[PDB]
Amino acid sequence: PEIVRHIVFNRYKSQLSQKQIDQIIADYGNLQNIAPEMKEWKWGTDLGPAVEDRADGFTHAYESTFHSVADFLNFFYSPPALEFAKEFFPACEKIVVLNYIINETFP
Amino acid sequence: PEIVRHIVFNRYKSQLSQKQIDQIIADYGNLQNIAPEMKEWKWGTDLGPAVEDRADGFTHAYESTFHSVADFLNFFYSPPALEFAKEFFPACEKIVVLNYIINETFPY
């Protein structure tokens, strides 16, 4: 059990301004600058019913990557990871989050 | 480039055999061969509530990559990915798909 991904989708609460949504993304970002375990941070916004209409109202998507299920646990119970979770989850109107061990292989 | 990302979450109907679930995960990985646009395909099952409890009853996760959106649409309509679609979305009892372009942003 070595490489695990953290994929979050959310929607934001309609009351929040962009300035605030921006400050929240940015904080998620430089989480890397405080948490060493956190690794391959990517975010982005669903390209709409235009392309494919199965976002069920989810708007954003965020990937974080880790070098051992052990590094993932150490992070998720650390001051910063918990600190930042109080900022972020309270701003979500929809939330869904999968950690999985990364698998390139079929069955 | 505008690297996109085709991230899927799902849960399969409870009536399908694991055999037939293992089947479908394999077809999804074997569209990477019958259309060269889909490009960094990886999967995993959710690690359960000891790690975290916010997966909302979705079991599996699937990644891809495309190097543009037109790639994705040629791919989306090709008889392979239109065929695999007739297999996956009825198997699916829950399903959410998010297509998006990359960002680091702030070092960049």
Measured distance CA(A42)–CA(A28) in Å, rounded: 10
Q: Other C-beta atoms within 10 Å of A19: how many?
A: 8
B5, B102 contact by CB (below 8 A) = yes
| Rounded (10°) CA dihedral B19, B89, B26, A51 | -170
- Whether B27 contacts B86, CB under 8 Å: no
- Provide the shortest C-alpha distance from residue A15 to chain B (in Å): 23
Residue in chain A lying closest to B55 (CA): A97
CA B70 to each of CA A54, A72, B41: distance values in angstroms, whole numbers, following the listed order: 18, 35, 18
Name every residue in B having a CB less than 8 A away from some CB of A: 4-5, 7, 9, 22, 25-26, 29-30, 41-47, 51-52, 54-56, 58, 60-61, 63, 69, 72-73, 76, 95-106
Q: Which residue has the tokens 């990985």?
A: B29
Residue A72 DSSP symbol = H
Which residues does residue A41 pair with via DSSP β-bridges, in sequence order? Answer: none
After which residues, if any, is chain B broken (C to N > 2.5 Å)? none
Q: Which one of B100, B102, B104, B108 makes the best mutation probe of the A interface by having the most chain A beta carbons within 10 Å?
A: B100
CA distances from B107 to A26, A33, A41, A62 (A): 11, 11, 12, 17
Question: 3-class DSSP state for residue B55?
Answer: coil
Strand partners, B95: B10
Between chains, do B99 and A9 touch, taking CB under 8 Å as contact? no
A20-32 exposure pattern, b = at least 16 Cβ within 10 A, e = fewer: eeeebbeebbebb
Which among A8, A56, A96, A105 is the top mutation candidate for probing chain B, defined by the most B β-carbons within 10 Å of its own β-carbon?
Answer: A96
- CA–CA dist A91, B83 (Å, integer): 39
- How many contacts, defined by CB atoms under 8 Å, are there between A and B? 119
Give the method of determination.
X-ray
Q: How many CB atoms lie within 10 A of CB B14?
A: 6
Cα atoms in the Cβ-side hemisphere of radius 13 Å centred on A100: 24
Comparing CB atoms, the residue among A30, A42, A99 nearest residue B52 is: A99
Closest to B87 in 3D by CA, of B41, B42, B20, B34: B20
First to last CA, chain A: 18
Q: Decide if A96 and B56 are in contact by the 8 Å CB cutoff.
A: yes
How far is it, in rounded angstroms, from Cα A31 to Cα B96? 26
Identity of the residue in A51, A96, A100 whose CB atom sits nearest the CB atom of B45: A100
Provide the token pair at B16.
């399908």
Q: What are phi and psi of B106, to 5 degrees?
A: -95, -35
| All residues at 6 or more sequence positions from B53 whose CB lies less than 8 Å from its CB, including other chains | none
Domains within chain A, CATH numbers bracketed: 1-107 (3.30.70.100)
Comparing CA positions, the residue from A7, A12, A8 lying closest to residue A57 is A12
CA A19 to chain centroid = 19
